[PDB]
Amino acid sequence: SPYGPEARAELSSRLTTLRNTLAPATNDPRYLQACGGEKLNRFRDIQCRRQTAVRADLNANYIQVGNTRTIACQYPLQSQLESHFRMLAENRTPVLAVLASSSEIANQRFGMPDYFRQSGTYGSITVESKMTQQVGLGDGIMADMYTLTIREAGQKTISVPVVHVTNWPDQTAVSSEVTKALASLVDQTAETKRNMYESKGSSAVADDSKLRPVIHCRAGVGRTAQLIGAMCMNDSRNSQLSVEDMVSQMRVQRNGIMVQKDEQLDVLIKLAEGQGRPLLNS
């Protein structure tokens, strides 16, 4: 009954209205606008909430779901790579979770630069990629780890752990068991990195805007939202936060598409049910 179909229909009713309301109008004040001709949004109809935007020229948002602070973004465009690495370094990013598959990245019709599996140079920024370990998450889903070393003349060199899930297909939900395992791996990767900064006295430890996990897929609204929802539910401080509130918060802080497919919401509903976490408010 709390997770029964009538309660599920009510959750969908509420979240669908929210989706329709957040649809970007033309020159929408709620959404970041492109400057002078540069393409900003990888998908025209998938925009970046202005109040929470990380950088003027990225489709990327600060996300806070209850107490859990991340960054969700689209796969950076080729023209956005220099700005994307600056965001990564400035955030002292404890983990970068890439959920776009190897097949999507390889498909050049998609304009998805291979920016974390290859060493490269992007304006003043030089990036060195090194593949570390590989990890299975269940159901055949595979993760490849890298560390990206981001150098720039006169800037502090930052190294970012990368978790790349290689075969989560677009517009699907991986299983709740896989989702729980991926959230654990991303959280643990981030904790290890944060601990390193802490052990060296890093002042970025006390700054809420920093040390956030950075997560993207292709648009940064389907698979990305499912992972953030799970990471949210893996933060004990988020006791009693309902599914309605978690998705609403993602949607008001990014766009109305966060949690894109019904199947992805179903995995959030299933994790919540396993916790005894409410679906609805009141």
Numbering used by the authors: 187 to 468
How does the study describe this entry?
Catalysis by protein tyrosine phosphatases (PTPs) relies on the motion of a flexible protein loop (the WPD-loop) that carries a residue acting as a general acid/base catalyst during the PTP-catalyzed reaction. The classical PTPs hydrolyze only phosphotyrosine (pTyr) residues of polypeptide substrates, while the dual-specific subfamily members (DSPs) also dephosphorylate phosphoserine (pSer) and phosphothreonine (pThr) residues. All PTPs share the conserved signature motif HCX5R(S/T) forming the P-loop, which includes the nucleophilic cysteine and a conserved arginine, which, along with backbone amides, binds substrate and provides transition-state stabilization. In addition to the P-loop, PTPs share an aspartic acid that protonates the leaving group in the first chemical step and then, as a carboxylate, activates the nucleophilic water molecule in the second step. Closure of the WPD-loop moves the conserved Asp residue about 9 Å into the position needed for catalysis.
Structures were obtained of the PTP1B T177G and YopH G352T ligand-free enzymes and in complex with vanadate. In both ligand-free structures, the WPD-loops are observed in the closed position. This is in contrast to the typical observation of this loop in the open, noncatalytic position in crystal structures of these and other PTPs lacking a bound oxyanion. There has been no X-ray structure reported of ligand-free WT YopH with its loop in the closed conformation. Particularly, for the YopH variant, the closed conformation found suggests the G352T mutation has shifted the equilibrium of the ligand-free enzyme to favor the closed conformation. The G352T substitution in YopH introduces a new 3.3 Å hydrogen bond between the side chain of T352 and the backbone carbonyl of M328 in both the ligand-free and vanadate-bound structures, stabilizing the loop-closed conformation. If this hydrogen bond is only present, or is tighter, in the loop-closed conformation, it would rationalize the presence of this conformation in the ligand-free structure in contrast to the native enzyme. We were unable to obtain a crystal structure of a loop-open conformation of the mutant, and interactions of T352 in that conformation are unknown. The difference between them is nearly identical to the previous report, and this smaller difference in YopH relative to PTP1B gives rise to its narrower pH profile. Its G352T variant shows a much broader pH-rate profile than WT, with a kinetic pKa of the nucleophilic Cys residue lower by about a full unit. Thus, the different pH dependency of the G352T variant arises not from substantial alteration of the thermodynamic pKa of the thiol group of the cysteine side chain but predominantly from altered dynamic properties that affect the factors described in the Introduction, which distort the kinetic pKa values from their thermodynamic values and affect the pH dependency of catalysis.
